[PDB]
């Protein structure tokens, strides 16, 4: 019988949004560290919550609806402060028309800000309904569309201009409206992982960070090798990772506690619902 | 519509064996280029054959089987010069006590399993009772006399449980040398010959990452030993030996052993005896 130690299950983000860390994860070695998983990020999200990934990227929502159960790593998120850029609406009318009108939206966290601004920020009461991220059919059945990720960067970058198509960055509506910066995505242990493994938990946490500040440092290197695939340019790429906000510190955190109580009551979870953090290890 | 060009769909085996080539994929940057797809030998054949691939490691018997669809990439193989070390027979008694005995075989092999069948009836002359199982050494110990293990399970059998348990582990490497004085070739990397027809130069770029990969393997066997043992049984020693062991060539003396190989078992495996391989064409160059 093997009982040797085995790797943690780490899930990441397979949107441009993460591709500087995973360049990062595997300059460094660090993958091999890891037994890893590449999915969207609900996807991602539902594997950590039910046991499938013992640490990954949590969209922010769905950390809160299960804050008791995961322990959120200090100092790197997905965010953004001020505009960004893969996460929009696109609208053929000027926002304040879709009062009534038909709003399509995206496969959970981008989704309940959108709604946030469209309701308490420019007061219209659209009809919202699911279908999958197509700009081109969502522009048919609809008046506006709320898209992430790549297609949003997409419909931001390309799509939008070709088209002619106002584009709002939910970013830059936030800091509009609240100047505050925005997160959408944490990295998160399950507790009940973190408890059996904190070095574990603790390595991973350290190699996250080692990795993201070599993401940064070298980000010219990513768009120049990204941009080959992709129909976005190394320019356009370049702008992308480095509008990108990937601290969580204290300005993050308290982003996120006045988002959690806008949105709470009517998402599912307190609207004060603690965060709890990796504790580093004190030394004597 | 998003017309970019896309990544190929990369193969990679996920037992110890091509863990450094994964950490020269990682190292250099290379795995960002690749839509990389780790799983066992026989299921990354079938996946590459049927089309969800468009590149990958192939076991040698299924790339023969599919020589006229696939095209091998030379200087890159999974192989030896002697001993595997990750390709054996366990067997509690000696092989020239096998004949009609139980004997298991790991169900994902497929050129190991046809090598053991040819070294057991036309080396030392005995016809098993073969059957296929999931490696399970332990299980198949209970209800077999002998077993064929590949990866990571045969690693273990000859490393660790066989001494523990005194049982007779057999290198199908050097059981092979003895017979033949050959070296041997267990898988091979191929391109989809339709992808290398429509993306030459991908196709190409590819094979030059991969070498490119396994040289930088090579030269940091021990980074990737040490890191790699933290994870495994196996200390650093030992996975040190079995990179250091296996062989990644794949020149003029592995494709002799690739051709006798083929004839001795293709009549009974599925291909012609003398069937083509393919070889990915390096680029003339005329400055
Ligand atoms: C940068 C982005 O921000 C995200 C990332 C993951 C999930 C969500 C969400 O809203 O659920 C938002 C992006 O999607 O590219
Ligand atoms: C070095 C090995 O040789 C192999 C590799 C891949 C497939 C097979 C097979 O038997 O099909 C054998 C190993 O398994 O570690």
Redesign the interface.
């Given at each position: 019988?093997?009982?040797?130690?085995?790797?943690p299950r780490v899930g990441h983000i397979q949107f441009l949004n993460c591709?500087p860390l995973?360049?990062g994860?595997?300059?460094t070695?660090t993958?091999?560290?890891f037994e890893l998983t590449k999915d969207t990020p609900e996807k991602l999200s539902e594997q950590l919550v039910r046991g499938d990934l013992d640490i990954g990227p949590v969209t922010l929502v769905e950390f809160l609806k299960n804050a008791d159960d995961l322990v959120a790593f200090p100092d790197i998120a997905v965010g953004c402060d001020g505009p960004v850029m893969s996460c929009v609406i696109v609208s053929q009318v000027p926002l304040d028309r879709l009062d009534g009108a038909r709003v399509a939206l995206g496969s959970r966290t981008s989704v309940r800000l959108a709604q946030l601004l469209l309701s308490e920020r420019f007061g219209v009461q659209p009809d919202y309904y699911t279908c999958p991220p197509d700009l081109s059919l969502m522009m048919q059945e609809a008046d506006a569309a709320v898209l992430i990720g790549d297609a949003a960067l997409?419909a931001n970058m390309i799509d939008g201009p070709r088209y002619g198509l106002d584009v709002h960055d939910l970013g830059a509506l936030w800091k509009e409206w609240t100047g505050l910066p925005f997160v959408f995505a944490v990295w998160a242990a399950r507790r009940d992982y973190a408890e059996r493994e904190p070095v574990i938990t603790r390595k991973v946490h350290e190699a996250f960070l080692a990795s993201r500040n070599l993401s940064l440092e070298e980000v010219e290197?990513?768009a120049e090798?990204?941009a080959?695939?992709?129909?976005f340019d190394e320019d356009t790429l370049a702008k992308y990772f480095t509008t990108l906000d990937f601290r969580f510190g204290a300005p993050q955190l308290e982003a996120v506690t006045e988002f959690a109580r806008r949105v709470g009551p009517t998402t599912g979870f307190p609207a004060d619902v603690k965060v709890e953090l990796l504790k580093p290890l004190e030394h004597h």
């Open positions: 019988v093997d009982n040797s130690r085995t790797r591709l995973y360049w994860l595997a300059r070695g993958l091999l560290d997409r290197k990513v090798q990204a080959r695939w992709e129909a």
